[PDB]
Structure formats: C-alpha cells, structure tokens
Amino acid sequence: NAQAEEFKKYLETNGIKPKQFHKKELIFNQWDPQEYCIFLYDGITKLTSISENGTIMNLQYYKGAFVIMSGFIDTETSVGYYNLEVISEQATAYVIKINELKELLSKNLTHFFYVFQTLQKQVSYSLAKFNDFSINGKLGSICGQLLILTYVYGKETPDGIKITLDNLTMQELGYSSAVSRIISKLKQEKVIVYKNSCFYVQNLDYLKRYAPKLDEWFYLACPATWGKLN
Amino acid sequence: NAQAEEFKKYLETNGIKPKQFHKKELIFNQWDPQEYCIFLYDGITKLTSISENGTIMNLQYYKGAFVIMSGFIDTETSVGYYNLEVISEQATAYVIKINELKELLSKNLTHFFYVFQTLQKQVSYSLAKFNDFSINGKLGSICGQLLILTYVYGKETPDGIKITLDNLTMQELGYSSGIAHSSAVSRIISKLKQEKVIVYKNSCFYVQNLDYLKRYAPKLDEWFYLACPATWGKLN
Numbered sequence: 001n002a003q004a005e006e007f008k009k010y011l012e013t014n015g016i017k018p019k020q021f022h023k024k025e026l027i028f029n030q031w032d033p034q035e036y037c038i039f040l041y042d043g044i045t046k047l048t049s050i051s052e053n054g055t056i057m058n059l060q061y062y063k064g065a066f067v068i069m070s071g072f073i074d075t076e077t078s079v080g081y082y083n084l085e086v087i088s089e090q091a092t093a094y095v096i097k098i099n100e101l102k103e104l105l106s107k108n109l110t111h112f113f114y115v116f117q118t119l120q121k122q123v124s125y126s127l128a129k130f131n132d133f134s135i136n137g138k139l140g141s142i143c144g145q146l147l148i149l150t151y152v153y154g155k156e157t158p159d160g161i162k163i164t165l166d167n168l169t170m171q172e173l174g175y176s177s178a179v180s181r182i183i184s185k186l187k188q189e190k191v192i193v194y195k196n197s198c199f200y201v202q203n204l205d206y207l208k209r210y211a212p213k214l215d216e217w218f219y220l221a222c223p224a225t226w227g228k229l230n
Numbered sequence: 231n232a233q234a235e236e237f238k239k240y241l242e243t244n245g246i247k248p249k250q251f252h253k254k255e256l257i258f259n260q261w262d263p264q265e266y267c268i269f270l271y272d273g274i275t276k277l278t279s280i281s282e283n284g285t286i287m288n289l290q291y292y293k294g295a296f297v298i299m300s301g302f303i304d305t306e307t308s309v310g311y312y313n314l315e316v317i318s319e320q321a322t323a324y325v326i327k328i329n330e331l332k333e334l335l336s337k338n339l340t341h342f343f344y345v346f347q348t349l350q351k352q353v354s355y356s357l358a359k360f361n362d363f364s365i366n367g368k369l370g371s372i373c374g375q376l377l378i379l380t381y382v383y384g385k386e387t388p389d390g391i392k393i394t395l396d397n398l399t400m401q402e403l404g405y406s407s408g409i410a411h412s413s414a415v416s417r418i419i420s421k422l423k424q425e426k427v428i429v430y431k432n433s434c435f436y437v438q439n440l441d442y443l444k445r446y447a448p449k450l451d452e453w454f455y456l457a458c459p460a461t462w463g464k465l466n
C-alpha cells in the first residue's frame with residue numbers, strides 16, 4: 001500500500017514516532033478521556049466494548065495499514081466508548097492525539113483524502129455486512145469473515161487455499177448451538193478443513209454464495225487482492 | 231444544524247443549486263457510472279441493494295442534513311452498487327460529482343471536516359446498532375429505530391412524545407397495522423403495545439415510556455448522545 005507508506009513517512013517526519021504493542025495490549029481503552037487517531041501500520045487488532053456488568057463484546061477487526069479514530073475530528077469528543085486490543089503477536093501503531101490530526105491533515109490533502117477513504121471503506125463494509133446478514137443471518141456473517149480471511153491471508157496451494165495465519169491468531173478469531181450447526185455444514189460441505197497445522201479453504205464459492213455483498217465490497221475496496229484468488 | 235447551513239450556502243456560492251425530488255424517485259441508481267456526493271439537505275431517503283433473486287434490501291435510512299457518497303474520494307471508484315430512493319413526499323439534495331467535490335473541499339477544509347465527521351457518525355452508528363442487537367437481538371433493533379425516531383421527530387407534548395411524521399412516512403418505515411410481520415416480531419410489538427411504547431391516539435403516534443426504549447437499546451442511546459447531544463438533551 002503506497003498511500004500508507006507515504007502517510008507513515010509523513011507522520012515520522014512530523015515528530016510522531018512508532019510504538020510497539022504486544023498481544024492483549026490495548027492501544028486505547030473505553031475509559032480514556034483523551035481521544036486519539038490510531039494509524040495501525042502493522043498487526044491485527046480488535047475493537048471491543050465492555051458492558052458495565054463485565055460482558056465482553058467484539059465489534060470490528062482492523063489490520064495495518066489502517067486508521068482507527070476514537071474521537072470526532074472536529075468536536076474532538078468520543079465517537080463511542082471502545083477498546084482497541086492487539087490480537088496478533090505484536091503490532092506497530094502511531095498514536096496521535098485527535099487535535100494533532102487536524103493539522104497533520106490540513107497541511108496535506110493527499111493524506112487527508114487517504115484518511116477519508118478509510119472511513120468510507122468502513123461505511124461500505126458495514127452496509128455490505130448488514131446486507132449479507134439480512135439475507136442469510138449468521139451464516140452470511142461467518143462466511144463473510146472467512147471470505148475476507150481467505151482473500152487477505154490465503155495463498156493458492158495444490159490442496160486448497162492455505163491461510164497464512166498462525167493457529168493462535170486463527171483461534172482468536174473463532175477457530176454454541178446454531179454455530180455448531182453452521183461450522184458442521186462448513187466441515188461437511190468441504191468449506192474449511194484443518195490439515196497438518198494449517199487451515200485450508202476449498203469451497204470458496206460457498207463463502208461467496210452467502211456473503212455476496214461483502215464479496216462485492218472487497219472487489220471494489222481491494223481489487224488487486226480480490227483478483228488473485230478469483 | 232449550523233455546519234449544514236454553512237455547507238449549503240458554500241455550495242450555492244460555487245454554483246451548486248438545490249434539486250427537488252419526489253417520493254419514489256432515485257437520487258441515483260446502482261448502474262450510474264458517475265460517482266456522486268449527495269448532500270441531502272432536507273427529506274428522508276433509503277439506501278437499497280438488489281439481490282440476485284431480485285429482492286430489494288433496505289440497508290440504511292438517511293435524513294437531511296447529511297452526506298452520502300457513492301465513490302471513494304481518493305481513487306474515485308465506486309463504493310458499491312446501491313440505489314438511493316426518496317421516502318418522504320419531497321426531499322432537497324445538492325448533487326455533486328466526485329471530481330467537483332475534491333475541488334470544493336481542497337479550497338475550504340472546514341467543510342472537509344464536516345463531511346469527515348458525518349462518516350464517523352455513520353461508522354459508530356452501525357457498531358452501536360450491532361452492539362444492541364448482539365445484546366437484545368430483534369428487540370434491540372426495534373427499540374433502537376424507535377428510539378432514534380423519538381429523539382429526531384419527537385416533541386414532548388402533554389399526551390407524551392408525539393412523533394411529528396406523516397402516517398404514510400411511518401408506513402414506509404414499517405409502522406402500520408396489517409404489515410407482514412414475523413412470529414418473533416409479532417410477539418415483540420405485542421409487548422411494546424401492551425407496555426405502552428408506541429400508541430395510536432388521535433391517528434398520531436406517541437411514545438409513552440422512553441425508559442423502555444432506552445433500556446433495551448443503550449448503545450444507540452449512548453451513540454446519539456455523543457453524535458447529536460443537543461437533540462439528545464431535549465428528551466432528558
């Protein structure tokens with residue numbers, strides 16, 4: 001991603017320095033009264049919300065390079081009480097106070113447009129995800145998530161599509177009752193298979209059949225990556 | 231909405247005239263190759279997508295003032311295949327081509343931030359709605375939409391909180407006796423009816439207990455307080 005490297009070098013040249021985070025660590029939390037703009041350069045993270053009773057809830061996965069903002073760019077107040085947890089072994093992120101961003105982007109429109117499109121990709125991602133759930137319920141969601149993992153971390157192999165994620169990260173993503181009924185169909189219809197410490201997805205058309213709008217979304221958002229396995 | 235007004239005259243100054251749309255008109259369709267930035271200034275609209283079977287899907291409702299963009303501002307490629315239909319009897323929207331938008335935002339960054347914020351509000355809206363659904367399922371979704379409709383179109387009258395919205399508009403949002411409902415949905419609205427949530431009085435819709443809606447949709451209430459605090463403070 002060229003636009004991300006240009007943004008990376010733009011932050012370093014403006015004083016903001018990278019920071020390393022390890023698994024289970026929170027780049028920001030739902031109680032911090034200071035809102036930030038996170039430029040997750042590398043690593044996989046997880047947006048969570050904790051109910052006042054202690055319930056944990058996952059709300060979105062992010063991978064670098066990408067931007068995650070916990071405050072509004074103008075009012076600088078919270079967009080919502082969330083945490084950003086690192087899910088992978090480690091991750092690199094440029095923490096930026098929400099106030100320092102308005103200047104960093106006011107001095108450069110190319111990077112301003114770059115941050116803008118990250119939001120648009122979330123909006124269009126959400127609409128596609130709400131669509132596939134409206135048609136296939138939880139089946140469309142599960143298939144949707146697998147579909148994206150296959151496009152991003154899948155490599156063509158003579159025996160399926162090798163998901164290049166360590167088994168620990170795969171388990172952190174979800175690998176009850178109706179869920180048991182779903183994953184059984186996936187293991188039955190030759191969708192996903194576990195072979196020699198590696199995950200392989202073979203019936204990709206099954207994932208596309210039940211997550212259609214998400215397949216469209218990834219085609220228009222990451223066309224280069226989409227064409228590799230299509 | 232101050233930023234909306236400021237953004238309106240700014241568009242008119244640069245030669246962008248308002249355009250009127252009637253109910254059932256499409257501000258744009260999925261097959262239009264031109265990417266747009268719809269600045270809906272007044273009215274109500276829905277974003278729709280067509281499935282393979284041909285079944286239309288309601289994905290999102292919009293009200294002015296608000297922004298809806300069909301192309302990525304950087305690559306200028308489409309974000310998806312959507313239609314934008316009018317729901318109210320009339321609607322005012324400033325249609326702007328993707329290229330002409332970058333020229334406008336590059337001149338004045340104040341409006342860039344306004345549009346930037348509108349997307350942020352939409353991003354956190356979905357996360358909150360999904361959060362309420364994960365906690366309360368369909369019940370959270372129903373109370374969520376009713377909660378927002380109350381904060382936006384609700385006026386605290388002696389007879390409760392009146393939802394200032396035409397009956398035919400409410401009918402287009404799925405609020406009318408005789409609509410095709412699911413068994414589970416039927417039992418939810420039945421309880422909402424019994425416990426006085428939405429009532430049909432003087433042919434107008436009122437909201438008796440606001441606490442019930444707030445209880446089973448807390449994340450949307452949290453969202454609306456952070457996104458639209460001025461409107462949230464009215465009924466609190």
Ligand SMILES: C[NH+](C)c1c(Cc2cccc3ccccc23)cc(=O)n2c1SC[C@@H]2C(=O)O
Binds near residue numbers: 061129130355360363
């Ligand atoms: C909110 N949305 C992005 C969404 C959806 C779509 C969705 C489902 C049900 C109700 C919704 C209401 C509003 C907006 C989106 C909704 C599904 C999903 O599984 N996940 C998400 S976030 C992460 C989670 C997932 O991938 O499992």
Ligand SMILES: C[NH+](C)c1c(Cc2cccc3ccccc23)cc(=O)n2c1SC[C@H]2C(=O)O
Binds near residue numbers: 065145
């Ligand atoms: C933030 N969302 C919208 C997202 C995702 C989410 C996602 C879905 C399913 C599995 C994931 C695993 C790790 C990280 C994110 C995941 C993916 C994605 O590729 N992009 C995006 S934005 C564009 C694209 C990208 O990272 O380039």
Ligand SMILES: C[NH+](C)c1c(Cc2cccc3ccccc23)cc(=O)n2c1SC[C@H]2C(=O)O
Binds near residue numbers: 351
């Ligand atoms: C675009 N969404 C996120 C939305 C909506 C949509 C909406 C939700 C629930 C019921 C509706 C009924 C009619 C039209 C739109 C609805 C409303 C809203 O006020 N805001 C937003 S963003 C913040 C706020 C606003 O316009 O100020």
